[PDB]
A paper describes a structure:
As the virus buds from the cell, the viral protease cleaves Gag into several fragments, including the capsid protein (CA) that then assembles into the mature capsid shell (core), rendering the virus particle infectious. The CA portion of all retroviral Gag proteins folds into two separate domains, the N-terminal domain (CANTD) and C-terminal domain (CACTD). In mature lattices, CANTD interactions form only intra-hexamer and intra-pentamer interfaces, while CACTD interactions are also involved in formation of inter-hexamer and inter-pentamer interfaces. Our results show that, like lentiviruses, RSV is sensitive to IP6 in vitro and in cells, where in the mature CA lattice IP6 binds in a pore formed in the center of the CANTD hexamer.
To further understand how RSV CA is able to generate both regular tubular and pleomorphic polyhedral CLPs, and in particular how the different inter- and intra-hexameric CA interfaces allow for the observed flexibility, we also performed subtomogram averaging on polyhedral CLPs. Most important, we determined the structure of the mature CA pentamer in these polyhedrons to define the interactions between hexameric and pentameric RSV CA assembly states. The observation that within pleomorphic polyhedrons the CA pentamer constitutes the rigid building block prompted us to investigate if the pentamers within T = 1 icosahedrons and polyhedrons are structurally identical. We compared the model of T = 1 pentamers with the model of the pentamer derived from the polyhedrons. In fact, the two models are virtually superimposable, showing an RMSD of their C-alpha atoms of 0.74 Å. This finding further underscores the observations that the RSV CA pentamer (1) is very rigid due to the tighter packing of the CA domains in the pentamer, (2) always promotes the same local geometry, and (3) is independent in arrangement of the size and shape of the CLP. In contrast to the pliability of the RSV CA hexamer, the CA pentamer represents a rigid building block that acts as the local organization center that defines hexamer shape and, depending on the position on the lattice, overall core architecture.
Numbering used by the authors:
A (entry chain B), B (entry chain C), C (entry chain A), D (entry chain D), E (entry chain E): 11 to 148, 152 to 229
Amino acid sequence: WTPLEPKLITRLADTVRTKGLRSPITMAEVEALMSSPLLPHDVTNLMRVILGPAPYALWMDAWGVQLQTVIAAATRDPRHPANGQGRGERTNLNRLKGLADGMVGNPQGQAALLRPGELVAITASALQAFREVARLAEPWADIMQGPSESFVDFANRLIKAVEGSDLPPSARAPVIIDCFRQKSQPDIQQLIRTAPSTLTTPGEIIKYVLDRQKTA
Amino acid sequence: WTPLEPKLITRLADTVRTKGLRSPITMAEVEALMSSPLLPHDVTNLMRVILGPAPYALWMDAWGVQLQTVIAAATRDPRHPANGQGRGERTNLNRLKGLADGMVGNPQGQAALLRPGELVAITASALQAFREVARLAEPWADIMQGPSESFVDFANRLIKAVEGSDLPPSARAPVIIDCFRQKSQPDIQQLIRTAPSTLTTPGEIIKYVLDRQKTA
Amino acid sequence: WTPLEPKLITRLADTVRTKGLRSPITMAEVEALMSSPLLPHDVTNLMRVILGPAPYALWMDAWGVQLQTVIAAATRDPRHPANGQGRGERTNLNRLKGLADGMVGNPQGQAALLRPGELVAITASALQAFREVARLAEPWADIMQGPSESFVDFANRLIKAVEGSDLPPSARAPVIIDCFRQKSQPDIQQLIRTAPSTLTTPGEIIKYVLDRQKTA
Amino acid sequence: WTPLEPKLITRLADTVRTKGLRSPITMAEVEALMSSPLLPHDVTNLMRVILGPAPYALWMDAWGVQLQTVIAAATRDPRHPANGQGRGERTNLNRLKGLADGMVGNPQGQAALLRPGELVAITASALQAFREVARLAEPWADIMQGPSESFVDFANRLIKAVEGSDLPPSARAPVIIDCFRQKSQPDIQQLIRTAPSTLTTPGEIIKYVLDRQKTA
Amino acid sequence: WTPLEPKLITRLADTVRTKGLRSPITMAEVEALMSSPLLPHDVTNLMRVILGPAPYALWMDAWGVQLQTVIAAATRDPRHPANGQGRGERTNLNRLKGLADGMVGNPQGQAALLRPGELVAITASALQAFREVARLAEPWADIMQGPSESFVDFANRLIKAVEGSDLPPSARAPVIIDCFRQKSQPDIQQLIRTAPSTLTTPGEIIKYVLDRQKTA
């Protein structure tokens, strides 16, 4: 077992501290530090360091739930890369959470007894749990373009709130367009209304408005 | 396929966050991270991370348009480094945008089937699209030297606004000179007017004014 | 003897300066720089640099006390990895604190005469002393959720103050739950009260409240 | 040809942005990045990135003037390390500024045709031009010690303004001394006046005043 | 001769700029960059870059004085590692300050003619001069604990001012104790007075007060 660098962990913790849990740069950094299959000890200490107390509790809950789903799929298929062929290799949650015999508190023994399939399953479970908690911790129909706000800031805020919401993926573009048309105070409303071409994409609307906007 | 370092990507994202999209240092950094030919997956994720939502939409649009121009030039010349000699090697936009069969979401297969000419064409297209969006996202005839502003700040602001505008390249120096002469409040106006030598370059005017300026 | 990098020491000192003595990231960084067995000279200079004057005095006291406990255990067992089999290898506190003959002020001679068991015992003692001083230097029953404060901030503050207190480890979760129920101003109080399910964990309570909270 | 690292260039640009053009640390950093003989392309892009628009215009002017002086010295001596023995190796300004045939815009061809003497001459010329522009871009007889200002701040400000001025090098110390004596509000004036020893150096005056100053 | 990295020098200069000249971290960093024996050119340029103008003048003075003491000890002992056995190897101050023949302005020739004993003597002299100037550039009996100030801040400030003063080393602990007892506003005064145990060390007093302090 080789531990992760505390320098990388400190940089990731400061990234989470400044950018937040949900920024795409933060998720990219987590994916980076989630590259090699980690032992339960590694992921547990990593989340202990980078996350606050309450997000850490939420993450422990979510990780347990995802690992339980994994173990249900494992008992539903004896060909799991964590399982074996005989019944003596069936993987219990004590072995996944690092609670089994010969593993509690000892990362060396952990790395000894664990399977690579076990490691990758634990890692994917932890990543999904992190995503859930990030989506949970920190309203698009209440967003208006302020009287003094520029249009690119309004578009950024609106696209952020619409994509980070509970809508299906196939309903984001029409909603963003129809919110550009009805929000975005009446000067830009009339600018979009009197478009000789038909704008059928948020990017095209943004380009058109940026071209023909009233410089002020 | 080898991914780009998330450390470099984080540094580039913070550079774009503090300096903006159009600064020459930002374009130099992008050229740096645009050195090796990138796969559509790499450039797409890079622009997803460094750009906000609305600039990312604009960039997707511009990248598509530039790739379409490339494919028109490719059907206009069967000797494209992305094309082949026979008709079976003609490159479709699904293969350029990474949408073709065996490539959607898989960077390894992407790197397998793609040509080096394909990669360099995609990369140049993405760079040109980034330039377009940067020029589009964030008035030189309205610039005056404030009563309390120094002259080097006024010259910096004016040269910035004139070079980052829609003028032809051969019309920037005369405009900068004639704006130095008519803006730049009447003390410096008279200082430039009573120049025993003829100043025929913005640098020479700046040097002269910095020499003979009223220390205050 | 090889000294620790002043770059790492400067980074650790700034970490202690911004995050404090008790943050889990700071303790992780200290554990990182406490990886190889250090000589008394190294640990002494390290604590001189990273700690202020008063915490350094406290740490000297605590380190002495812990080393005295170690020496009592050593005279209680002749099989200490710092001791030897005969009486001529018994380790005095002058040899542990670096005060013995041939060691005062000289790290090379120190590294010469010291045992690896001596080094690891000194290191563990210094780590425990650092923990004591950190817990000592900088009230959970006085924590209320402010009228304008969000719930995740209140939960973070409360869990921090409860886990960094004098309670036994087996009494933190019930106290955190019962403080969520009685603090956390009456809207969230009624939200937790009318829970159709029984919430038996701080993480579950946090998840439930974050789901059903009044968006405002 | 190998390009300079954009990381070093970004760090140097931020150094120039925070410290300014004239700080000794900035000149040291420029000397550092001016260590290996650079091609006209390298120096031109470097100054384009680190300098603003108006300082870049000034620097282009100054670089041209210094290169013209170099070419005059070259036509005044056929043994220039840039020249050759016959008349066919005489170096024109198009070859120095990178404007000659086979060099315009191409750094590889540039590195091919250029001589090492050419490179070092271009580099020294660019360094001298940078020094000129830095001295030009951003009054010692108007400096007074404020009623609330400390003496080391006043001495720093005065020595800075005197050494960064148009005085000869052999006239700075007497001026600094006589400005310490006549500025530096009458308490320190009388403290310097009643000096039982004769102080004949700014450092000695500073030491004496720091010793006998009125602690307040 | 190999120059020191301008990156390390820039980091050290910023350390001196933020932390000051007298902080233990700054002295540790200087000791770090003072590890290999430096040539007079190196130390001179280093102090030119990291120190301001007035501290640099003070440091030149102090370095000269310390080198003169070294040369007096050298003429008092013909076995100096800088000296030789015959009279022709006697080391003059022109050779120490780098002013001798073949050394003025040339670091290569400097490194050629200088002895390793010369280098280490110059280096130790420069370090002692830096210590003197740092102690000189930027009152413990005037320190009171403010009505709103915490006790650890007061203890830090007091220990700093007492240890960075003109007292002998054997008089700091009693003074710190008696200042804890008479300063440190009457609540803590009575808390220390009514100590059932006798506190005979600043660390013990700090620990006792931190234990029994009035939480508020």
